[PDB]
Amino acid sequence: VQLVESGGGLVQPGGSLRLSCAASGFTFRNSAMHWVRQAPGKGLEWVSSIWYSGSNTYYADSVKGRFTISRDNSKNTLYLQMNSLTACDTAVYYCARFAGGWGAYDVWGQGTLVTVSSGGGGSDIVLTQSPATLSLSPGERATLSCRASQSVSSNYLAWYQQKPGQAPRLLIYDSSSRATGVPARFSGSGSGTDFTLTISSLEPEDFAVYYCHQYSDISPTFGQGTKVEIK
Amino acid sequence: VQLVESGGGLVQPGGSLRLSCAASGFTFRNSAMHWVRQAPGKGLEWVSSIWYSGSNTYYADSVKGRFTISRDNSKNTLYLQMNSLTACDTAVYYCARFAGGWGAYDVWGQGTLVTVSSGGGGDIVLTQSPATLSLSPGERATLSCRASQSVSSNYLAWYQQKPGQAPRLLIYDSSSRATGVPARFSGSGSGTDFTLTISSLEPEDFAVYYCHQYSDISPTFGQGTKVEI
């Protein structure tokens, strides 16, 4: 009693793959068959199901409208056609027989890794911001930090303010240049991998989420933000 | 000097939307124009860029091959064609002028929310606890799975997953111990509250354990409990 899985691999975004699952040791034509996936370091996630007949296909929202489940009962084979692949599809995909009240997922394929990426073997510049949250009162000085995983060419680092429900607003660019109209209490500094945004004296309108942003290469990245809230 | 955005909204998985961004107050035809997005509760993420004829358009892997950035310079308008949309595209999308060393993103559109979902206004959420268990051999492990709604027919299963292997069925129908599973594993519970007990732990029991409800047409899993020896 087994499910012999095949397919998968590393594919460019937008691409297509077909997974296969050849069944033996049970009455395939009498069995509902499902796909389940598991993103790296994450939990099991249902993907798709098909009735013994080939009718009544169902799909999780993560794949609906892009993936197609099908079966060939005369070949005891289940398929998952994956189209328009995107980075968030990256995961180990398992086929499974669904026995319902007579066994849940009682037969599993061994799984195959699908990775959707156009990336080289290197890594992007990761920006870490500290602290995650600042509880301050108006009048106090706030010092925000942005730490880059590697050096930032030309000091191409910018800071943005974002209030709830509003677009980001440029504060500082080139690590230290104040954007037009920005009050003088906003000052940025640093070079290389360590950068700092300073608000000399907080006003009530300064409470917001602040983002750092590096634009030194073709893969611009952002920090995850620092929230300045009233204490 | 402004960017006036349009489009967005709620769309079914696999569908398509076009966003647009109409610029005024600067020589748009020569500008480098980007799209940037923000998932709900998350941070900013660059999406796509386009600049003069003679340079490449660029896309992040999150959208490459599905989305198309374009411009109609005679209309001073930037576009984002979003095809085969998926749940992980849900986000507020901003257009922005990129000025590089002269200002990074110095002009932003006001943003528009794109939500990709087939759901109604209500899914059974399974919450496992503890997240982590550290025990020694011979001890007994008690694992818990709480459901946000009653699990019809007690159609609840438990799986064992060892590192790098496929899940293994332990328990189904809340208490049925699967063929070949040792009697020290036992499932109990009913309705919204289920328990997995593991007696006389072995080193081989080191694994992650997931619960699973299959009481409806939208099966869901718990996030798992890791038990180490």
Author numbering:
A (entry chain H): 2 to 124, 201 to 308
B (entry chain G): 2 to 123, 201 to 307
Tell me what the authors wrote about this structure, in their words.
Diabodies are among the smallest of these bispecific antibodies. They are constructed by connecting heavy-chain variable fragments (VH) and light-chain variable fragments (VL) with short “GGGGS” peptide linkers. Therefore, the two VH-linker-VL chains associate to form a dimer with two antigen binding sites, each consisting of the VH and VL fragments from the different chains. In order to investigate the structural flexibility of the Fv interfaces of diabodies, we have determined the crystal structures of 10 mono- and bi-specific diabodies with and without bound antigens.
Although changing Arg83 to a threonine substantially reduces ambiguity in predicting diabody structures, they remain significantly diverse, which limits their use in designing protein nano-assemblies. In order to reduce this structural flexibility and prevent chain shuffling, we introduced disulfide bridges between the VH1 and VH2 chains in the Fv interface. The sites of the proposed cysteines were designed initially using the “Disulfide by Design” program, with the crystal structure of diabody 6052 as template. In order to examine the structural flexibility of the disulfide-bridged diabodies, we determined the structures of three of them. All were designed by the “Disulfide by Design” program using the crystal structure of the 6052 diabody as template. The three diabodies have practically identical structures regardless of large variations in the crystallization conditions. Some of them were crystallized in a buffer containing a high concentration of salt and organic solvent while others were generated in a buffer containing polyethyleneglycol. The pH of the crystallization solution ranged from 3.5 to 8.5. This demonstrates that the introduction of a disulfide bridge can essentially freeze the structure of a diabody under a wide range of experimental conditions. The disulfide bridges we introduced were located between the Fv domains and can essentially lock-in the relative conformation of the Fv domains in the diabody.
